[PDB]
Design a protein around this ligand. Sequence first.
Ligand SMILES: CCCCCCCCCCCCCCCC(=O)O
Ligand SMILES: CCCCCCCCCCCCCCCC(=O)O
Ligand SMILES: *C(=O)CCCCCCCCCCCCC
Ligand SMILES: *C(=O)CCCCCCCCCCCCC
Ligand SMILES: *C(=O)CCCCCCCCCCCCC
Lengths: 68, 68, 68, 267, 235, 235, 235, 288, 288, 37
Amino acid sequence: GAQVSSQKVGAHENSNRAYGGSTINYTTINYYRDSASNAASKQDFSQDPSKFTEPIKDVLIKTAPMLN
Amino acid sequence: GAQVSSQKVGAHENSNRAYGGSTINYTTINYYRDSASNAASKQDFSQDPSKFTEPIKDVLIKTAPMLN
Amino acid sequence: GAQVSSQKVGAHENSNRAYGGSTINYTTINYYRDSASNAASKQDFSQDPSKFTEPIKDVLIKTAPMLN
Amino acid sequence: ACGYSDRVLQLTLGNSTITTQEAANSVVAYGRWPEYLRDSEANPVDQPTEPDVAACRFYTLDTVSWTKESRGWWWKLPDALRDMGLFGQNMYYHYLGRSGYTVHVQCNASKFHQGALGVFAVPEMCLAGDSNTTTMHTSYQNANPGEKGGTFTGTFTPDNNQTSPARRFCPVDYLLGNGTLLGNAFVFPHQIINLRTNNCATLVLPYVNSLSIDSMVKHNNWGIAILPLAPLNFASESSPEIPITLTIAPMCCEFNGLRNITLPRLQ
Amino acid sequence: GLPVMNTPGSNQYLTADNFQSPCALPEFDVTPPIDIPGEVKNMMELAEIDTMIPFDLSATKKNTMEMYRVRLSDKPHTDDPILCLSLSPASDPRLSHTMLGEILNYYTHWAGSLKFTFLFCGSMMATGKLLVSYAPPGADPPKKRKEAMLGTHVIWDIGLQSSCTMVVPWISNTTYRQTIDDSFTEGGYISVFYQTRIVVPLSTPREMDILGFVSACNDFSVRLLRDTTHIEQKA
Amino acid sequence: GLPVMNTPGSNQYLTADNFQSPCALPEFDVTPPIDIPGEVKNMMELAEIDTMIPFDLSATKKNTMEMYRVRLSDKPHTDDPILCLSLSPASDPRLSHTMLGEILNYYTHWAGSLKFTFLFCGSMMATGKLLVSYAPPGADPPKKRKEAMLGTHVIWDIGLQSSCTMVVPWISNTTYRQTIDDSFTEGGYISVFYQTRIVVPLSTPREMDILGFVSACNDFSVRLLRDTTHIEQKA
Amino acid sequence: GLPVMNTPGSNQYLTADNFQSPCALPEFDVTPPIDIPGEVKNMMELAEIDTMIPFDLSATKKNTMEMYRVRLSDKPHTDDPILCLSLSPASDPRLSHTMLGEILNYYTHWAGSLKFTFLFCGSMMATGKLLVSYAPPGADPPKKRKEAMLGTHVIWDIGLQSSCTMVVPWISNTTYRQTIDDSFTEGGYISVFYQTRIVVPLSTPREMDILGFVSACNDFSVRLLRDTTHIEQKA
Amino acid sequence: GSSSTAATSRDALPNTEASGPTHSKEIPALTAVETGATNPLVPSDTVQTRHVVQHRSRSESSIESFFARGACVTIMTVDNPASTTNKDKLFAVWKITYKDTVQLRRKLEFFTYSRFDMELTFVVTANFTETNNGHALNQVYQIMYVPPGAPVPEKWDDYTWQTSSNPSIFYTYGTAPARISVPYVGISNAYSHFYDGFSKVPLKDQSAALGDSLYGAASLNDFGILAVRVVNDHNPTKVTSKIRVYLKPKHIRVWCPRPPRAVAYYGPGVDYKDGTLTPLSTKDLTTY
Amino acid sequence: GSSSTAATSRDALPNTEASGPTHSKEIPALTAVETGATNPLVPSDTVQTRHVVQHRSRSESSIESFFARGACVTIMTVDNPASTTNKDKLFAVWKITYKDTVQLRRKLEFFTYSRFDMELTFVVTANFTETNNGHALNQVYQIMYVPPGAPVPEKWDDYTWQTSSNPSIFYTYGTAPARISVPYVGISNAYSHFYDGFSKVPLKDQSAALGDSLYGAASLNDFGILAVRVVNDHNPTKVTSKIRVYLKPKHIRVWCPRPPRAVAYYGPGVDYKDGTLTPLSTKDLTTY
Amino acid sequence: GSSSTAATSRDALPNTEASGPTHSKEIPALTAVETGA
Ligand SMILES: CCCCCCCCCCCCCCCC(=O)O
Ligand SMILES: CCCCCCCCCCCCCCCC(=O)O
Ligand SMILES: *C(=O)CCCCCCCCCCCCC
Ligand SMILES: *C(=O)CCCCCCCCCCCCC
Ligand SMILES: *C(=O)CCCCCCCCCCCCC
C-alpha cells in the first residue's frame, strides 16, 4: 500500500538517466493503524489572504476609489 | 502477502494530494507462522447490549406498559 | 516506486545464470520528500571540451592552417 | 446612477434601524457572516431556544466621552449585553449560548476636528492583570464590567496591597492590554474612525470559539477595543470633547440547557 | 545487508505498543472456543445496564444495605428535596461506584446521555406523585421544587407501572467531560421532590423506600484509557 | 532475519526530522473539527496584512502610543525629510516589530515586494501634497527632496481618499536578502518629504499626525526557518 | 517488528559512501540555477586545455617568469639537446604543476595520449627547423639527435603558422600508469633538438624564446581518486 | 498497491507582468485604510515593470512547515541515591504544557486556536555527583503518562507504576531518544491558546470563596502529568538524571491570527511584569 | 511501481583508428596558439596507428565523482567539567565554512562557482584529562545550527538550546556518526568561491571608516554557525570531547575552471605569505 | 499479494433525531424494573 509522490528538485546533479530530470519520486508506507503515528506529508495548500486583508462587505476594486 | 487497511483520520493536516483526505491507508505483513505472534488488528465489532439490558422472554416495546 | 538501473560490471564472477553476464541491475528507493536527502545517482553526462579548448569565433579545422 | 454609496448605509435588525451617511464600508470578520449552529456541528441535544427578533436587535450602551487625555476603552461580548432586554434574560436562563453580533461604533465631529480611533474586534481578548505577585488573578467581577466597559492606561501600576488586592486588569494601551504591540492589532478585524473621513465603524462578528456552543456567563467570545491612534484635536482648543456611542445587535443567537435563572455575583 | 538507519523510538518499550513478537510455543494445539453465553464486545454495553445508586451515604448508612434505600413518607406536602446529587458520574460518591461510574474511572473523558430510573417499593395501596429533575449547570443548585421544576424534569405518577425513568440529555459545552470533579466540565444537578405527597389508607405503612438506578443511553461513549483510583496495592 | 547494515545517522535525534512513531493512545476517539472562522494556511498571509509602523522611536516616545504618530504641520515648504527609514524589514527598529518584521525574524532569508501605506489624520479642512520615496541602495541616502525624487516615488495628494500606498518593488542583487543588517544584501532607503506644504484655513489645527503601515505583496516569500531574538527566557 | 540481522559494516562511516540522510531544512525554497557560462562536466575537460610548461627550473630561474622560457639562439648547428624531459606527467617537476599534472595528482592512475605544442617567439625574420622527439622507455635516454630521431618525432619548420604539435601516442605495457615516478610504469623521454639552426638576418635578435604547452588527447583518462601532495596544512 | 501523486504551498508565486506608462482615472495608489482593508497592490500598479518569470515559493512558511520542529518544553530531574540516604529517591512529576518554556509558546500564540497530533521525543542524560570512584550500571527509566483522575505516584516504587492502563515508556539509557505520538486529544474541537473566561460563575447566593476561580483558566488544557522514575534499585554511588521533553505539533491547523508576544512572558496567562515593558529601542525619526 | 534505466561519464572513450603514411597539404601538426585554442590532435594525425577498441572511460573524473567524498572541515572542542570549577563549561561555536582546512578548499577552488546539496557527517570522540580514577556516564551532545540572525548561545545551558526553530542534532556517544543533508541554500544562483568586490561602496560624502569593508568578503557565504554542547550536567571527573565535521558536496555542478592553489593558503582570501612563494624545485633543462 | 480492507467498534454512534411535543397513550417514561430489564 505504497504512496509514491514527486519531489520538487532544487540542486540537480549532472544526470538525466537516473537523477536530476526524469521526475524524482519518493515512497511512503504507513506502518501504524493510528493516523497520529504518521509522518507529516508536507503536501499542503495555500489560500487567498482576503479574509484578513480584505474583510469588507462590498468588494474592493483596487483601481477604483475605496470610498465612493 | 500484504494487508492494506484504512485509517480513521482524526486531526487532518492541511493536505489533500498526499495526507488528510484521499483515504489514508496502512500496511500490515505478518512475519510469523503462529497467529499468537500477530499484532492486534483492532478492527473490532460491536453488538446490541440486549442480552444484558433486555433479557426478558417477551419483547420490550418501550412506548408500551412494561407490565400488561 | 523503485528505480532499477544497470551496473557497469568490471570483474565478472564465473557465472551467467546469476552473476556476471545477464545484465546486473540494482535498486534504489528514495525514502525522503526532500531531494537533498537523496544519494548521488552517479549517472552523469559528459560534454565536448570546446568551450575551453576551442573558444574561437571561426571554427577550427585541424588539417587546415590555423592562420589564414 | 441612483447614487448608492459606501458611505451611506442602513442596517435593520428586529424593530431597530441604524442609518449612517459617513461610513467607510463595513467589515465582516474573517469573511464569515453569523449563522445558526448546523446539525453536523451540533452538540447539546435538547431543542435550542432561538429568540430571533426579541434579542437580535440593536442595543445602545452608555455613551462615553473622548478627550485629549483618553487612552482607550474596552468591552467584552456577551458581557456588555448581559443586562440588555430579552438577550440578557435568555443568556442567564440557559447554561449554554452562542451568538454573533453587529457592532456599530458611533463618533461624529466636524470638518475642523481631527483624530482617529482604532476599533478592533478580538477573539478571546484576554487582558493582563494588575499584579506582580500573583498571575491570572483578576476577579470575575472586575473582568466583567457589563455595558460600562473598562479603560486602557498608558502606565502599568502594580497593585501593592497584598492584604486586600484589587484583583483587576491593568491594560496598557501600546501593549493592547495583553503583552503584544498595539501596532499589530490590525491583524484582528477592525475599522478606523478617522474624523475627516468617517463617523462610524461597523463590524459584523460571527460566533468564534473552539466549541460550537459554550457558557456565555463564564466566557466572553469577543472583545471590542477602541484606542485613539491619533489624538483628538480641535481648532486651537485645549480641552475638546466628543462622545463615542456603542450600539450592538446579537445575531443568530441560540441557547441550550434551560433551568432556573443564573444570579451572578457582580460586585 | 540492506542499508538501514535507526530512528528515535528505537529499543523503547511503550506499554501501549502493538507489534508482532516470536511465539514461545510454536505449533501449539490450541483448544477451540465453545459458544459460552454472555459474550461482551464493548465496555459500554455494561454501562447501559441499570445498576443501583448508593444515594444515602450518611455516616451510619454508608457501606451498609441501607445506603441504597431512599426513605419517603406520607408527610404533608413540602417543596424541600428528597435527594440532591451532582451530575459527575465518575466522581460524585453516589455515582462513582455504580457499574457506570466504575467503568468511567478507567477513562479520562465521558460523553452522552444518561438515565435515572426510580422504583417505588411501598405497598400497592400507597399512591403519590413525585418530580424528578435535572438542572444543567451554571445557576444556583435547586433546593426548592420551584427552581427544580424550571429545568428538565419528569413528574412521576406512582401506580401499576412501578418505575419511572428520567433521561438526562447530553447538554454540555465541551464535546467530552472529565471523569473527575471539574468546574469547566461540570454537568449540573439531579434532584427529586414531592409533587403532591405520598398518601396511604389506614393499616398501611406510612414510610417506605424508593430505589434508584443509573445507566448510559445508546449515544454514550468514553475515551482516553487510564488507571482507576478505585483499587490499590499498598507495598 | 533480513540482513541489514546500519548507516551513519543511526540513532540520532534530528529535531527537524519527519518520521513515524507509535501512538501512546491507540483507537482514541478524536473530536472532529468544526468550521472555525479565520483559518490560516501560510504565515505569509499574515505578512500581507497592513500593520502600523512605530516610526518615532525617540527616547521619550519609544514604547508609548506616541511612537506610531508622525507629526506634520502647516509650516512653510521645506525640502528636508519628515522621516527616514532603512529597508531592512527584520532589523531596522521601526520595521522589525511590525507583524511583517516579527514573522521575518523566524526566517533567515526574505524576498519580494513590499508596500507602505500612509493615512492622513488631520482635519477635513487640511490639504497638502507629500512625496513618498524609495531609493535602492548604493548611493548617498536621501536627505533632501532633490535626491529622493530621483528614486521610486509617489506624490500623494491629500483628500477624500485618505490614504496613499507606495510599492517598494523587489529590486535586489541577491535572490533573497538576509533578515539581519547586512551590507551585501542591503535594501535601500524609504523617506517622506513635503511636496508643497500642509495648508489649513483659520480655526483649524495646524499640526496633525499621519500613520504609516507596512505589508508584503503577493510575490513575497521567506525561507530558512530560525529562532527569533525577539523572545528569551533568562534562567 | 520485521526480523532483521545486522551485518559487518554496520554503524561505520566510510567517507566514500553514498547513502540517503534526513534533511535539516525540509521544504526549503531553493534558488533555481541560471545558465552561467563555463560549466564543466568532467575534470578531463580541463586536462585537454593547453597549459604552459615550466621547462627551465634552474636554481635562478625556478619560481620566476623565466622558468617558462626556453632560450634558443642562432648558433651553429649542434646535435646536442635544447631540452630533456621525462614522460612522467604527475611527477617530473616540469609537468607536475601544469593543469594536467595538478589534476593527475588527485588520481593514482593515468592512461592515454598526450600532446606537446611549442610556440616560437622570435622575430618574424627568424627562421629555423627543430626536431621534437618522444622515445618510449627501455633504452639510453636520447642525448644526441641521432638517437632522438629514431623514436617518434616531428620536424618543425618555423614560419607563419607559429606553433607545432607533437603527439605522444599512448605506448605503454600496463593499461594505466602510476602518477608517481616508477620504473615499471615509466613513460619514456621527450626532447627537442636543432634540426638545421636558427637563422636571422642582420639587425635582428640572435637569441629568442620558445614556449611549450601540454594537454591531454580525447583518449585520456584517470582513475583511483587520491589526495595530492601539492597542498598541506602544517599544524 | 501503489497510489501515485488547488494552489499548493510549494507552487511558484505569480509572475511579474510587464507594464508601461499610465495616465488615467484609475487610482490604485489612493486608498482608505479606515475600511479595515489592506490595499492589494503589486509593483506594476505604481511603477513600470518588466516581465519576470517568478520561481520563488512559500513552501517553508506553510503552517505545517513553520511548526515542523521539536521544541524543548521541560526538563525533568530524577535520581537514584544510596539506600542509606536520609533523602527519598527522587522521581519527577510534570504537568504537561508548552508554557514552561517560551519559544514554542510564542510561535503557537501567533494563533488563537489550533488542532494537531503531538510528537514527543525524550532526551535522557545522566551524571555522577559525589566525588567518589563508585560505579553504576546502565539505567532504565519509566516515563508514565498519568491522565487527569488517575492516581499520581507518591513514591518511586508504589503500586501506580504497575501502569496497567496508563501508557508508559521504559527507556534504556544510551539508546536512541524515546518517541511517541498522541492524537488531537482536546475536549474541544480545537485547543484554545487563549480562553477569555473563568471556570466558575460566582453566584450571589454563595460565598465569594466558593465562586472564585482563576482568570483565563479551564480544564480545556488540563492534560495530566508525566511521572518519571529510575527503575533500578538504589545504588551506593548516587546518579542524577535529566529527561528533556521535545514537542513537535504535526498535522497542524490554526485559526485567528494574533500579534506575537512582545514583552517577556510572566506566568501561564498574558500577564506582564513591571520593568519588562519596553521592547523598542531608541531611533531618531529622520535617521536611517 | 518500478522505473527502469547523451554521452555518459561511464562511456568508453573513442577508439583509435588505423592510419597509414601520408604526404599532402593537410597540416594538423602546425598550428597557432595565439588564437587561444588548443590543437585538437589525436595520434593518427602525426604517426601511423593501428586500430584499437578503446574500453577506458572517464567515469571517476566526472564532477560528482571527483567530489564524492566527505572531507574534514573543522574540529570542535567541548567539555563537561566538575561543578566546582572556576572555569566555565566549554561549549563550541563554529562559523560554517570549508576554508578552515585546505584539502576540500583546494578541490572546490578548481572552479569559480558551484551548486550542491551538502551532506554533513559528525565524528565524536571523548577522553579523560585528569589522572584521576573517577568515571563518567555516556554523553549526549547537542549540535545546533544557528542561522544568521538567530541568538547565539552564551552559556552551555541558556534558553537558546531550546531550539524551537533552529535544527538541532542530539547525538549519543558511541553510536554511528551523526549525519544530515542540507539543500543548496545560497542566496545566489550558485555559491561563489571567489568574489572580486566589496560589501560596501565607500561614499565621498561619508567618513572612510563608515564606508570600509574587507576585500573579497560578502554575506554570499555567511551561513551562520554550529553551536555544540555536552547536554549532561557537570560531572566530578572532567571529560573533554571533539566533534569532527565532514562535508561532502553531492548533486554538484561547477563553473569557470581556475588554476589550482599553488602556494600555501593564507587566510580565507587569496592572500599569500612571504617565505611560501616557491612551489617549484630545481631541475636542469637538459636533464631527464 | 495485497488484501484490501457489521457494526464496528469505530463506527459513529446514532444520531439524535429532532422530536417535538407529545400528548398520548405512549408511555416510554413509565416502566417496571422488576422484570429484570
Ligand atoms: C507516554 C507519553 C504520553 C504522552 C501523553 C500526551 C498527553 C496529551 C498532551 C496534550 C498537549 C496539549 C498541547 C496544547 C495545550 C493547550 O491547549 O494550550
Ligand atoms: C544541524 C546541522 C545543520 C547544518 C546547516 C548547514 C548550513 C548551510 C551551510 C552552507 C555551506 C556552504 C559551502 C559553500 C560556501 C561558499 O559559498 O564559499
Ligand atoms: C502496500 O502496502 C503493499 C506493498 C507492500 C510493499 C512492502 C511493504 C514493506 C513492509 C511493510 C511492513 C508492514 C508495516 C507494519
Ligand atoms: C505478501 O506477503 C507478498 C508481498 C511481499 C512484500 C514484501 C515483504 C517484506 C518482507 C517480509 C519478509 C518475510 C517475513 C518473515
Ligand atoms: C515504489 O516505491 C513502490 C514499491 C514499494 C516497494 C517497497 C518499499 C520498501 C519500503 C519503503 C518504505 C517507505 C520509506 C519512507
